[model samples]
Target chain A: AMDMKITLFSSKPYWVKWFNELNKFSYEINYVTSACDIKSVNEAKGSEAVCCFVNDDLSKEVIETLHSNGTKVILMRCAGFNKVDLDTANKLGIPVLRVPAYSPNAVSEYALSLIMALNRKTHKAHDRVRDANFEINGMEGFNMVSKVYGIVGTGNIGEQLCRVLKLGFGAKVIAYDIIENKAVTDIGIEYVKTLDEIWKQCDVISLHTPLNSQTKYMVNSESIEKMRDGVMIINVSRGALVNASDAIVGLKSGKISSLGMDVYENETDYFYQDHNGSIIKDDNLSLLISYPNVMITSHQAWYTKEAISCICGTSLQNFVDFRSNQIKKSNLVNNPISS
Target chain B: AMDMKITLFSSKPYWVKWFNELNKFSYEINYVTSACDIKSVNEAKGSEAVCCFVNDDLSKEVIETLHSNGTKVILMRCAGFNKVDLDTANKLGIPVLRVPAYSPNAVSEYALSLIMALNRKTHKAHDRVRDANFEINGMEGFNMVSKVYGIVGTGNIGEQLCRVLKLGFGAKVIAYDIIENKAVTDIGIEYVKTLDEIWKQCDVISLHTPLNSQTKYMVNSESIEKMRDGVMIINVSRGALVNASDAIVGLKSGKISSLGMDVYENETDYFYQDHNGSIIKDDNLSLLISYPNVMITSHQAWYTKEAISCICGTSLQNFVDFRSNQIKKSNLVNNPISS
Candidate 1:
């Protein structure tokens, strides 16, 4: 086996402690913060392959820069590929791979908890109890088994979410997915052909799809208008999936009963870390968090032990498998295409 | 409404405050801290009716003594009739009326909290987190919907318990009751013919029956031996219903997985109020509480705002009803007619 010098960009300090196991194979590792604006691949000056994330803006110009700079591959440590132009990478002979699921329970349970908390008025009651009043004023939760839940995606997390709400909560699940997944069929989840069906029927709507050009602000005023009044909205998958401003309008009109979110559309600067003392720069998120019916967890939906282990383990093995040229068929991204 | 003297036996400070509304009707209230034993009915020698509780010994001799001493009626301020001898009351021409259901939610919610706490290991994990240990080892919870839950006694409290579990946790219910309660049938809960069927199949079991001679010490070793291993047992109904000593044996042998109890046969002096510094003298209770699997709450299961209102309201109304001879069919006693 040959040793390889793998470069990871814009990584956190926790990844260093995590990479200690990868050092067993005697591979040279270099990790540097990607530029605040990585518009082109010329930013990756010296590396065999570059590991990048959603905010890196890996465009055709960036791929041309990386190809000339001698980078053979691009590994993404996340599920979505909206930020990267795959056609450029394919033409430039640079393979790309991404992890499909970090942990299903992390996102699914958080969604479930938020729904229950919102329904039961737990957040309000928690504060009330802290004041020693202990009186349950408005803390009434509706039965989950009586409600219809709509899931917007059928990917790994989405399917698992359906399983939990369906099997665990006995909720009727109306799912909308561009592609059918095996777990949906196995669990007997009803596949809805139109989003309007979910909007009209579901009491709780959770988004699990990626944010793309078509879906950047999918849950805008138009969509919210079609949804049942007082329907709970949950978005842990992507920030841009729901327009916070429009959601606020929906909330004002009682179109949305509650909101459970771990990700905000413009969360790159504020999420994943503490901002306790700092005045929040994003007023949309600040306003969202201030609402009585909104629940936020700082983009930690995939921060469970199982998810973290998979992330670290796979990132390490990707390096090993790449060096030995024994990468599995799923791992080998020979033809990275444009979205 | 004419003013009358209302004598309260075994009165606490709360009882004094609770019965204050009766004062508005011009009733002069007399508070009696100590209740009559078989030899002490002279304590209420001049009282028309005596309001008592479960801790007081309502023996045949005591009822006869009360009758001879001019106590015409007995008002029980709580559920459970094990201590009261009905046949003796019949012979003595004494009438007994009980606050059968004060607060069903109090017991029902506490029972559900017990299940969630045990299933999620929430109690232990909460203590651990309080000690600055963030590790979530052994905190995994099985889906409550995955199991069958059996509730005995389908009374008011039992019915509420069924609704919460079915609506909140999505648990399949198997209920057994001596009477075919409308609430159980309304929920479509399967009524089991044999108590053994409930013991054999239930993953969680809750008792909500009155403790009569036939029902006293019902969930002892013999009954528990028929239950599935690791079945969670909850009792907010009556302490004497499950023999405390026998339950300890079940818990020790792993025949029962966990115990969640709010009442114990010997908890007369200790329950309802906190005993912060005093030693818990009961060996069986001490052992049961010491076990990691057992959870005990002081006998406050009937505590709730709504329940308190009903208890005070209906209790005094019952007194008024008795004086005016407005006793309903359910309130009638199978006794020699008393004036």
Candidate 2:
């Protein structure tokens, strides 16, 4: 792994410490402040592989530019590859490697944290008490015991949440997934066949589905209307999973009591940076942040010590395997093809 | 119950709704904004019973005044009677009735909320992200799975918390209590004999012990020194359970990484009120609130729908039972005496 150059796009200043701790392979890394799009494609010149995050826009033209610049591999530091042009990468014989399962505990716990934070109003309580205003007028939370909590997807993160809600908080956890997971069903989590049951029965709902056409706008106005009144919704998976505009309406109408989201639909412009002094141009985000019940965090669920170590270690291992002609099928997103 | 007159001291405007909901007997309630002290004792005149909360100063003189005003019963809206002069009430033949064990699920779940909130830094994250600043510099938290968590008391709240920590979050829970609760032990929680064992072994410690002569200052400097470096402490029980001065020292020395307290030693003057637009006189409290890692809530652990209902229901029942001359022994703090 020595003498290998890797260009990381959309990298932050805080990531330097974690990446430095995991650089046992002595791989040379070139950190780029901007996301990898058409304009920033030259940042990967002469590099063996280009490492990018979920926010980086790796379109067909950008992938072609990286190929012409001598970048043969695309390493995703995250699980999702929606921003990458997989078809173009396959056509150019450029293999894509991703850290698919980096510490399911990190994201799973974060989703629960959001749920508890919003439910208990801990965020508002912290701010109010610090200012010596200890009034709890609108802060009467309900007990989670025996409450019907719904899980949208029964993936790794979703299954972990089911265990936490059911066993830990004594919640009656119901779930909706196309393929039922036995690991969750074995623990007595009722798997519903349709999302309609979740909408009607659940007091709280958490989304762990991927961002795709089928899942996009799953929590829109129409579906929200079907939900129980004062329902709490948490989304740690992706931004497009719920329409922000529709969610604001739900919040205003008292249909949705609280919302906690770590990702936003237009987060690429303003996440992972210091924009405190600048005025946010996004009207929906600005209004949403002003609400006492809404809590929005930048996409940082998979940011634990263990998760970062796994990501860095697997990323370097992918490079070593590619060079030695022993790349594993699990790490590759495309088949072998001639350049 | 229709002709009963109950004067509630230390009452807030928001409590009207809960009180109205619980006014099934159509009893007359006189709400006072201040605590029950020497000056406020006149407000209880002509009332058969006086309802007080935690911040009320039920001193010897105040109790005597209340007794002289024909207030035969002292109804506490909370579990703690530390602020009440119980000996004076017994001598005056004024029996004190408390809402003991009101929804243990509320306080237990809140303790876990503080743990998850501090572990994930949701308080800091919520403030930073709302200001359009999404940088997560010191926000990296650890996973609670397999971590050693210690509970000081094994009462109703503690047992519920053990289930959440051990079964919900996959934590290895160790507890310290003199009585040794079977419910906790039955759930596979290890009960320790001494505080030192808990201090040395636990990564995170939660306080559920009542604040008395013994439990006060239980988490002082010496005990904090024995704990693991960067240990987290949560106190939803009572503020004086931990010495604030010693806790600040530990926080400054990097020994105590985070502190989440809902009550404070000098919280009587400040808690349960709006002190905004005014400077706080408590220096230690001011400094404690300024710390990014310290989360100070204004004693709101028992402020849930279920807990409030329990408090109101049991409090009214205590009055009803007293009028019928068939008071239950469990609700009374003292033996019956002739007036």
Candidate 3:
């Protein structure tokens, strides 16, 4: 067994169990609770590999610091490479590997969770019941089987969302994606030509699209006006997909009856940390959170037991392969580091 | 136009719009906001028809008072007639008519709502997010498609539950009933011969059985012991099916991970009323309410816009039939009063 030193940044307390098990594989792991930045790159000194999560700031400066500190590989605990300085890592001959997929069911189920919770007013109902007030005047919910759902993306996560909504809830699912996926189409889901069809027809809309130029701010004021009265919007995807300020307007005008989101535009400033004692300074987010019809879940759609185990196990295995001059072809972002 | 006098007892403020629409049929209706008791029965004086709901005390005294007050027909706005003294009404020559079934979809959808809400921990998640806490360490939830659900009744409501769980959510459903229902069986639902089978195998269990000698306290300590370590329990049916005290124990011991209930064993005094200013006297209920894993809704499974509309339309139609000396067979509890 070859002993390898690795530095894990943005490590949460929950990830300790998986890392403890991974330690038995002859790996010397150093845990850093805070997110990785240029200053935090000092923790990666003398280590062969540096492990990080999405919240870690792997900018060009941080990547350069790690490369100068003798780190040969970067292991991402998530699939997205947007936060990583992949160009800098390639230039410095540092290989970056990621767990391509964690658990699609975890994210999809969470989207459905938000949808059902908003649809049934479960949060409001629970509060009312706890207060010894049981009058259900505002608690009437419609049958999901009779409602139409719109999926804005048809990737692995969106396909699972379609499966549950279409087959599980007996809901009619219509999707709009630039590129069609056979996995989603094979399940008998209708692919609409444009978002207009979904906006006009769907009773509930859930977002699963990745953040890109065309996809950013997709559900803005103009699109909100095209939706049905009392339409429900769910965003478990990127925060930039929907303009939260416009959402607050739609909520006030009653154009949107309910909104459930796990992601927010400026979530990084507030999410994954405790801010209970301090007042939130973000007026748009604070106002959005103040509404009874809106539910926010701090970007935890992918945080499940199965997904967490997969993330830790896969990322550690990638580290193990890097030590033996071998690479996991499936997990690599590309063939090798390019100059 | 022929004028007929009707008194609506146990009336809610929301029911006024429906009753106003019924008044267009030349029926003069009076409303009483309080539940029907001996004193409240005086409001029915000089009325030809007396209307009551589930919360009203339609015992023999109230029935005789209505009978002596020139009330010829007693109209029940709900399906359950347990509170009404039917024998006295039959002997007093006063016929009873009720809305036989509200929208089954309404009640069934409520059950599914409870299932999804509890499964995803939406109530807890909502509270956390509101407090500016977005960490999801204890909020991990599993996929519903991978679960086995047990239904304790195969009635119309249970059949719909089966339909949604099986056809909609792609969950494996098993049910138990006194007599097998083809409506459920035809959909490929497996009927277990005994409750033990359901208690042992199901990941989640839902109760749709009526409160009777056979089903009372069915989910006691013994039955709860048979369930999986972290099984979820949903009861939109009668609350007496599960002993609340035993349930608290089950929750404390971690034998039951979650519970969602719309009914309680002693819910009549507390379910529909608002006691926010006062402390709940029931110690067991107070303790159960304090638990984060338990979600309680005041007997609102049958309360929906569609169901409310149906209940009003059907009951008013029955009054129309009674005035013409032609009672609808389906709506009638029995034939006209026997002398």
Candidate 4:
């Protein structure tokens, strides 16, 4: 309960406010509105730890600088490490601790939200009806009954998605994952060995896998060519999994009939804020918005009260645990040490 | 296939075109733009069957004229018998046959669509983002995780809604019905004896009951007073299941935090169409639409290609089955004997 400090980058006020309110152990915190850039690195000088979200500058320089400036632990409140230079952190002997699972339901349910909204065209319907245009031309939607869904990654979030689509709506769910998730299999969701089978079969394909070497750009031109015509594609996971340009082309070809994105590949520049009540950014993201069939939302799938509470609790506990030298090994993303 | 005529009242051209295309029996259909009133009843003079949608005028006079005009059967492409004078139809020895369960998934999934869209407010998100207002200021959504849902009537459509909410998304579902649906209980969805308990305990309440003396206006001011604050109520059933004025009051008071209506109480006058790209209708409905938390769609919960196909296939089959005197008993709505 002394002066051990943790600096949080990309500290949006709503989240920052909650962090302090939920911080029971009362650790000192430095909230930086600007993300982790070279200049912003000075703010973390006296802090014992650094906490960055998915979009922060976690390049080698930042990681190296943090190591030299007395920062011992690198924490991510989010699950993804796409931008985090884990190699540099390992080399610098700084352990990366993450709030790996904070509300799996938030992201999983958001995917369903996107799916339902996109399918029914209710947003358009809601808009049309509100202006007293109760007309329902081009408002027909297909039922999820006798439908098939495919999930690329069957992690905790994906597993919940599978259960909802399968047992709840009675859709036939076939999923593919690197290592088979026994929980998914137990729920009678079929597992396939190849991505092509999912592409060939499912009416809708939702990506929930982490963005990495084998998974990034996995839903590009060649792969989408294998999908069913008028296929629905949703991403509540990373943006790069589906190539932006390839998605537009797929959309043009009507191969990907309806698309929903909570994250975009080039989202960091123009995402997470209104840009001071912002007017614009990202032509690829903006261009996709022009299409009536596509729905693009800011990466807000995890912006729930319960999730924020869980994250604040997990992050504060990480600080206390690290101080006690009893941090749970499961919370550790990287194993950097004084070897 | 020789001139077995069926006159379709309230026939929109789109559905008429589909009807003709899918007509395997090639029965002659006289498509009437106007609904069945005093003058429009003449259109059914020489027809063997009279087809009416839910909104058509099916009072005693219309039924008597239809009976005298050599019409043997009354057909409803939709499911409700609210406007139909069933006792008169029975007195004239006319059997009422309907497309009882065209697409259970259509309505069941529609309830989900309303739930998700209203909860997430994606319509607002889509509207804002399209204008480059990417800020998520008021766009924070609650998770469906550990949520409790109430289904007032657990029929085919309600049962499926229960499955999706309970087994699908991990919501605790408590339902009420006249006779307990064993299928629902088998899926491990709990059943409650009192509607008050459901109103008191659940986060969201959906109506799936028929409009009758015992059930009409089931959700009123008293019921609203009992519901949890910020409760979401969705009606894909007949509109009168919830009083429109009561709902508005509840909405204004923030007692009913989120309201979604696919049907309205006085919906017959202005519910179905946009009155030739229509500009007006009921004031309560129009006023309810003014609220940001409320979503009002036309009675289109069953408007899907698959559902339409099912309706057409079942409707045409009803004609054939009536002529052959082998109509399925389940499709029969009311028994009219020639005693």
Candidate 5:
């Protein structure tokens, strides 16, 4: 039983603490400081597999470079695989495996956190109260009870959020998904026949869909125009799902009252890294920060103590099962030699 | 009902709208900018009742003047009646009437907002992300589902919060109150026989007890000394129930990781008024504002659309019933002539 070797890109201190704690099989793991790209792909020279985060360069050229270096499998530490060139991996016979969900509660609860924080104006209160400006002016908020909460995609995180909003906080929830989960509907959560209704009906809307062709920029100017005025929007799912430029316009016109995001479209260059005391290059990100009603959390929706265990546990298991040739079907993201 | 009249103390523009909207009985109202006291008592001379808020003078002299001016009932626009001397009111046959619970959901939901915001580091993220510093260094958080939440005082707001935490957020809650609430216990929320258990085992402890002699400064140095390190505390019920000085010490020592408060013990002179660009004379308020771990809202937990209606609707009902000799027992804080 030869030990499998892999280069984990974008090495971080916390990840090192977590990954080593769950290194049950003790795979020969190489932690690399540089993010995976054409240049950094050489680090995987004789490695059998490669590990990556969301911001790693996984374009066609990068994948081909890895394939030439004898990297047989692509191990993903995050749920998102949008930046990944899956079609190229399939053709190159490099199977892609990922953790489908580390902890849905972490993300779902965070989405709820954004909604409540925005609705109750806690963020603004935090700033004002710190200044000893004990004024309640412009701080009046509405109760969440009986408000129509809309969910864009009823996946594990979205469905969990819907359950918490409805059953826990006495909120009235409506959801829209192409294929509705029966477990969601069984709890009296109604699925809208059309996505257009979500814009018109919901007082607060949360996006939980994946980033892809059909879903890209779903909350653009046209969709924002259909939405209720003074509507609140929460996006802890994927930043690309909503057009940040269009959202800025919506906020100015009061079409969208408040926004809370854990992710941003142009965040890959900046997020998960500290740019403190540095000049901001992204205008949209800078402007979103300046608004009183907007709250951003640096893409930390799934940040929790339990998430590390869930992710590292599933991540290592994927390698163990893959080497043993008894891998779970859910972990596989691409059809390769088996097809 | 011969067209009752009353002077509302500390009048503002919004209260005019809320009160006028619910003027179902057409009570002749006097909205004076000056607060109620001996000098301003002349404004309420012809009125049968005087409507006052938390800050209004309800001392022996003021109450005797109010009674001599022919005021039969005292209408309080707030839930707190601690400032009013029941002995003086009872002797004068001026039964005090107050809004018992003006939107418990508003305060409870707000308290939960504080907990989640503090728990998820949303407040810190709000400031950091707005500054274009997308650092996730101190933003790591834990899931709320399995944490042990300790609740002090199980009154209307506390009990509602308990229900939401246990039923909605999947939290394991333990509450302490002098009187055990059956509904809270029925929901599988265990009632701790001692308050010490809350300080010992809870990851987050929220104070919902009223401000009384026994409960005043309940969360002081002695009690805080017993709390687990990094425990989060929320106080939306009453400010004096917790000693702010002790809290600051605990926070500085890292004994308390985070705190969110909608009320503070010495907030009477500072809260409900704007002191923008003014020097913070209170050292405690200034110091508390300096901490990133502390979040404070200006006594706005009960500020909502429903609270206005609830307070005004109940205030009017109290007067109408008082004149009809069928006042609800819940409305009366004193057993004046009936005794």
Candidate 6:
């Protein structure tokens, strides 16, 4: 409670302003807006901890780079840790903490909105209506009643999506997850063993799995080739799970009719702001985005008031504990096996 | 089953195309495309029955005019029967029927989508993004998680709306209906007595009641004054239920933050087609629609395939039965003991 309690490395002001209002514990907020790389870890030389979002590259080199500087702690203001080099941080004795439960409803509803918008072709219709040409010839939408909606993961966001599809739209849900959610099963959801089964069965496929070795590039040519022609796809979970080039192939071949993407493999540079009336350098992302059938939402599925508060709160907590030698629970890479 | 007969008067080809496709029924589809009124009923000169949508103005004058012209039955392709003169039809012994259960989900789901879209400022935000401009200034949305939603009727459409809100977004639903629905109660909904009380407590107020003497102009200045200021108001039920002029007053005063309407009071001329890039003639409607907070759908709440099929199938059944003195149980305005 004395002096500035914590030092946040990189964050946004709207989130910080909202956090202080909600969090009982006060914080001295700091934000690093400029793009950072492995070399930029040296900038937080005096700070006790470093906080980074999904975009900032926290590779093995960056962790070692931060440890060599005076930063003994690393905090992720997000749920997934795939972007962070956990093995390197563990070896370097740099404690890493993260905000685990952001608002699942935020991402869940956003993805649903994208799927509904795509299914109904409302996005395309709006543009046409604006131009005084409201021909509904290609704006046809099939009924979602009793349609099969498939989810790749059963995590927080995935579980919420499953509930929405089943209870909201009266959809038949097919889920595939290594560790199945009992909640999904309680609602009479069908569980499938293979991804191909979901591709064939579902009218729409939404990716909610974390991107890693087993999952990254999983929705490639081989997997997408097995999907029902003209099936809708929504990706709000991870970018690398589906390759951009492979998605292009799917779209061109009519294997995927419409795609609602919140994250892309090369989204860090292109998303979050307007590039209107300008030519995008990334032709792959550009080609996919320029298509009428595709809807690209900047990676903002988790940018909700509730989730923003948690992020600043968790990052601040990690900072305060570092100053007091209180031994933070999430800050440490490995639990100390307390008695 | 000779030529499964159809007398399609005042009908469009898009609506009666299915009749021609039915192998069991040969459709003698006739079109009288001009405005429907007293003089227009004579256009049903050779037809066995007359088909009308929302605005055929089947008043006593129109009904008697049709009776003198040899029209014995009225088949309303839409759900609402407000335009028909029921007492006059009962006196003439002309059985008047209308499509009732034509995809309640279409209206219900569309109503919910309007609320969700308006709540999230999705239409406004979406347009900005489509223009390649992604600055989200006045587009922050409140969570639908546990928010109170008031539904003004518990018929098929109203009940479906409540179910989606409660089951989809986990909204606490308070449905006000003179006639209670067991299905609504089974799904954890509370029935309220007075409509005025719902206005005070709910974050969103959706109109689902029919446009009758008691319910017509129900959501005008009086109701606006009663509702919580900035309460999101949605009307997919009936255009007359929402006084567009009164809505403008509410919107300007900030008593209503957003208006999500699928139907408008004077929507007959403009809706169901494109008049974009041209100066919209209805000044009040054009101004209201131009507002950043408004989202209009041009009376397409019941445009889904299931809804269309229901409209066609039910209307056809009523048309055939009325012509040959066959039984017609589901006649909306048959004038029985229930009236």
Specify the CAPRI tier of model 4.
Answer: medium
User: Candidate 5 - CAPRI tier?
Assistant: medium
Worst-scoring 10-residue span by lDDT in model 1 chain A: A125-134
What DockQ does each candidate score versus the true complex, computed on alpha carbons?
0.06, 0.76, 0.65, 0.53, 0.63, 0.34
Best by lDDT: 2
**Cα RMSD for candidates in order:** 9.9, 1.9, 2.4, 3.3, 3.3, 4.4
lDDT of 2 by residue, B47-153 (tens): 99988888899999998888787889988877888889988888888889988776788998888889889888887888998889988777777788746999999
lDDT of 5 at A146: 45
- Native-to-model Cα distance after best TM-score fit, residue B37 in candidate 2, in Å: 2.2
How do the predictions measure up, each by TM-score?
A: 0.55, 0.96, 0.94, 0.89, 0.90, 0.86
Local distance difference test, each candidate: 0.70, 0.86, 0.84, 0.84, 0.85, 0.73
Backbone clash pairs for candidate 1 read A10-A34, A41-A62, A86-A337, A87-A338
Clashing pairs in 6: B4-B26, B230-B255
Residues A1-339, model 5: lDDT tens digits: 124887899877767777888887868888997889888888888888888888998889999888887888898988878789998898898888999885888999899889888878888877776666766667777888847899999988998898898878878899999989887898898999988999989999999988889999999999999999899999998888989999999999999999989998888888877787787788888898888888877888888888867887788888888789887899898887732
Candidate 1 structure quality by residue, lDDT tens digits, A2-96? 12656666555655555655457665667665531344345566667677655566777777787777777777766666667788888876777
Using DockQ as the yardstick, the better of models 2 and 3 is 2
Global lDDT of model 5: 0.85
Q: Model 1 - which docking category?
A: incorrect
Best by DockQ: 2
Residue-wise C-alpha lDDT for candidate 5, range B1-339, written one tens digit per residue: 223897888787767778888889878899987777778878888789888888787888888888887888998988787678778899888889888776889889999999889878887787777666776766678888868999998888888899889888788999998899998999999888898899999989999887789989988899999999999999898888878899899999999998888887777777867677788787887888788888877888887777777888888788888888898887788868732
Q: Residue B11 CA error for candidate 4 (Å)? A: 2.8
Q: True interface contacts reproduced by each model, as a fraction?
A: 0.01, 0.80, 0.73, 0.75, 0.79, 0.31
